[PDB]
Amino acid sequence: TKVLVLGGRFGALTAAYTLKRLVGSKADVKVINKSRFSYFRPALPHVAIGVRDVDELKVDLSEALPEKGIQFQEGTVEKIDAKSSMVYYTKPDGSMAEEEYDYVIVGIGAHLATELVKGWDKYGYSVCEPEFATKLREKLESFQGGNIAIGSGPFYQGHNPKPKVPENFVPNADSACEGPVFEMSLMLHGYFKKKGMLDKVHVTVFSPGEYLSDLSPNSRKAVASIYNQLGIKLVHNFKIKEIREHEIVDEKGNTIPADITILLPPYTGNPALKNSTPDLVDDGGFIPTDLNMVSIKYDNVYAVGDANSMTVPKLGYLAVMTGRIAAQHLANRLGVPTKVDKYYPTIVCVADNPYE
């Protein structure tokens, strides 16, 4: 039995390791990732005064994986042909390979559509880009004063076909990961407060839809009250279209002053999935599955983490959860009786609570 695991982070690594440990030699587990190394840092930076806390885990998939009985091949997936059970990918040398599988576990995540933001190239500061968070660190340090805009881009969620899960297990969100925006807004305030710059710095928070939609209206009004107290402005229904040197523009031509723009780019499906068997994916480019992580159309395709339709918000712990379930269910299929954990929707993002 040959099992291909696509990607190299939360969803992929969890599924690979979990699967190999469960079935051992009953299957060949091979991982295909677009890069040799996978990095794991802290979600949000440590904006402290004169104190920079570096902390990253750097995994070499080529050495870390074989060490566990898992083969590794570096390559960029271009599409999956679910009908013939083939994965097409470009190898480092530029050559195009097409390999077949008995089972595939898709963990290549989603896509941060920075390309949908005019001026991102020249003026953007991303919170989700590796060392892009270093460029921000420096700018925030040398900042004399002015306007700061922090927020996220729209979530191009897919809707059809629908995952085969219980009702209300998948929320509809305008933003894929909004919690980090709240936390960062509070941090930026504390940082500038410690520098006696509250009067020189003006923070605006923007949301593609209603801010923190998992909360009740009162809880949302309460968050708005905190912002008001802290001197933070809130702009709802602002779908970013462009970033200029001193302002940001939405889809309707409206503007927000911003000398520094901190953006969580819009989320769209992974291009490789958009270019796969049309009926494997929904209209967003995500793979709808059942509670066992098995595609609703192809019984030998598993989707984990961000790549799966049901993971809303797009959380790393849901990635780990899904990666584990996919591996347990498959193990049972390969003749190794295993308990398959039950999937749960998150209900609410704990970062909504300021005491967190």
Ligand X SMILES: *Cc1cc2c(cc1C)nc1c(=O)[nH]c(=O)nc-1n2C[C@H](O)[C@H](O)[C@H](O)COP(=O)(O)OP(=O)(O)OC[C@H]1O[C@@H](n2cnc3c(N)ncnc32)[C@H](O)[C@@H]1O
φ/ψ of residue 287, rounded to 5: -95, 110
Which residues are annotated binding-site positions? Answer: 7-11, 33-34, 128, 270, 306, 316
> What is the rounded distance in angstroms from the CA atom of residue 128 to the CA atom of residue 119?
17
Catalytic position from the list 150, 223, 326, 349: 349
349 binds, among ligand X, a second copy, none (CB under 5 to 8 A by kind): a second copy
Number of residues written out for the chain: 356
34 binds, among a second copy, ligand X, none (CB under 5 to 8 A by kind): ligand X
Which residues contact residue 234 at a Cβ distance below 8 angstroms, ignoring those fewer than 6 apart? Answer: 204, 205, 206, 207, 211, 224, 227
Pairing of strands 103-106, 301-303: parallel
For the segment 288-317, give every residue that binds a second copy (CB under 8 A): 317
Give the largest CA-CA distance in the chain: 66
Contact between 175 and ligand X by CB under 6 A: the answer reads: no
Look at residue 209 and give its three-state secondary structure: coil
- Residue selected from 34, 233, 236, 274 as contacting ligand X according to rule CB under 6 A: 34
Contact between 225 and a second copy by CB under 8 A: the answer reads: yes
Angle at 90 between CA 118 and CA 326, to 5 degrees: 90
Which residues are annotated binding-site positions for FAD? Answer: 7-11, 33-34, 128, 270, 306, 316
Contact between 70 and ligand X by CB under 6 A: the answer reads: no
CB 319, min distance to ligand X, A:
4
At 207, the amino acid letter reads: S
- Residue selected from 73, 321, 329, 331 as contacting a second copy according to rule CB under 8 A: 321
Contact between 95 and a second copy by CB under 8 A: the answer reads: no
350 binds, among a second copy, ligand X, none (CB under 5 to 8 A by kind): a second copy
DSSP secondary structure letter of residue 238? -
- Residue selected from 270, 289, 295, 328 as contacting ligand X according to rule CB under 6 A: 270
Contact between 141 and a second copy by CB under 8 A: the answer reads: no
* Residue 93 Cα to chain centre, angstroms: 28
- Pair of tokens at residue 248: 């940001």
- Pair of tokens at residue 121: 């190239």
Place of tokens 């695991």: 5
> What is the rounded distance in angstroms from the CA atom of residue 202 to the CA atom of residue 230?
10
Q: Does the annotation count 349 as an active-site position?
A: yes
The residues of the shown chain that bind ligand X, judged by CB under 6 A, are 6-12, 33-35, 38, 43, 76-77, 107-109, 127-128, 177, 180, 270, 272, 305-307, 314-317, 319
The residues of the shown chain that bind a second copy, judged by CB under 8 A, are 166-169, 171-172, 213-216, 218-219, 221-226, 228-229, 317, 321, 342, 344-350, 352-356
Which sequence positions are flagged as catalytic? Answer: 177, 349
